[PDB]
Structure formats: structure tokens, C-alpha cells
Structure 1
Amino acid sequence: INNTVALENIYERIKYPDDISFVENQAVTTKEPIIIENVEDDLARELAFYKQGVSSVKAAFAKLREANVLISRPHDYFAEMLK
């Protein structure tokens, strides 16, 4: 099993268009792997996830400001919350 050639072809065929905007794509997949080797422990995993989320948030906020996407939630604009 594990047909690498077939899997790569499927991934390329179903690959999303990278030309989409960062806000539109909403993807923050970077190149530096923020993955703690001690992720089995709760503290190391939480720190690695928080660092990845912080970098993702900063990149998204910068892209949103560049793309004129008002990421700041307005208090006046009331909508049903997820929770």
C-alpha cells in the first residue's frame, strides 16, 4: 500500500488554487514546523499550538489589513455566536 505516486497525483489534481487571497483562502500553512517533539506532554503541545496560532493570527491580521478585511468584530454588529 501507500502508493506515493498515486497519492501525489491526487493531491496535485485536487489542490486548491494558490492564487486565492489569503483572507479568501484563510490558510496560514507556513514553512517553519512549529511542532514540539514533547507534544505528548500537555504543556509542550499547548505551547507549540499557541505559537502556531499566534503566528497564524499575525499573518492573517496583516493579510486582512492589506486586503481591507475588517477582522475586528464590531460590538454594534450583533450576530449569533458559535458557542
Structure 2
Amino acid sequence: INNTVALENIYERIKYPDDISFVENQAVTTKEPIIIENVEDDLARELAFYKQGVSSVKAAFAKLREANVLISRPHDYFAEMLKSDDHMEKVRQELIKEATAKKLSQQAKKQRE
């Protein structure tokens, strides 16, 4: 088992060309070996992925600068979104009840004085 030489040969058989542009590749791997060892802390790995993503987003946008592609999309553009419309309407209504408790949290804590 674990025939890495054959896997490397498979990596040679599935060897995507390095001459492809980063915009053409549509991928930016984190240069640092990002290892968030906090298996217990989910918030630690969430920010580490965000930090590695931000490091990638900085590198990808720089690579997109060479590609001269519109990294930012127009807000006036009304193209198809990944998120559904009715679910997003319920998503905004879901956050209304959370801030309502937070508003009552800040008011009552200030009312404790």
C-alpha cells in the first residue's frame, strides 16, 4: 500500500501544466504550510484558514493584477448569485432576532447601574 512512486507517476499522469495562469488555474494555494493544530478550537482553524485565504487573496489579486481581471464584481451587476433569494431573505430575518437580544443585552446591562 501507499505506492507514492506510482502516486507521483499518477501525479505525473495528472500533471497540470505550470504554464497555466493563476487566473486560468483559479486557485491560490497558501505558500506557508498552514497547520492549525487546534483540533479542539474550531475558531482557531477558521481564522487560520481565513488568514491563509487572505494571504492567498492578496496573492491571487496580485496574480489577477497581472491578468488584468476584475477581481471585484460590480454591485450594479445583477447576475446569478450562489445564494438563493428566499433563503437570503430568511437569513436577514434570522439575524434580526439575534441583534434584538443584543440590543436588550446592552440596554439591561446599562440598566444594571
Counterpart in the other structure of 1:66? 66
**Secondary structure of the residue that 1:51 maps to in structure 2?**
helix
How big is the shift at 1:30? Answer: 3.5
Note if contact 2:36-2:44 (Cα within 8 Å) is conserved in structure 1: yes
Where does the alignment leave 5 or more consecutive residues of structure 2 unmatched?
A: 83-112
Counterpart in the other structure of 1:23? 23
Q: Give a deviation string over 1:8-63, Cα, whole Å, max 9, x none.
A: 10011111111001111112124321221113311211121111110111111111
How big is the shift at 1:76? Answer: 2.4
- Deviation larger for 9-18 or 29-38: 29-38
Aligned-residue Cα RMSD (Å) equals 4.9
Percent pairwise identity: 99
Structure 1 residues 58 and 39: alpha-carbon distance in aligned structure 2, compared to 1, 3 A threshold: farther
Structure 1 residues 30 and 45: alpha-carbon distance in aligned structure 2, compared to 1, 3 A threshold: closer
TM-score by length of 1: 0.87
Where does the alignment leave 5 or more consecutive residues of structure 1 unmatched?
A: none
1:31, 1:57 → 2: CA distance? 12
Note if contact 2:30-2:53 (Cα within 8 Å) is conserved in structure 1: no
Larger Rg: 2
Note if contact 1:34-1:51 (Cα within 8 Å) is conserved in structure 2: no
1:39, 1:60 → 2: CA distance? 28
TM-score by length of 2: 0.66
Q: Which runs of 4+ in 1 moved over 2 A?
A: none
- Deviation larger for 57-66 or 31-40: 31-40
Greater helix proportion: 2
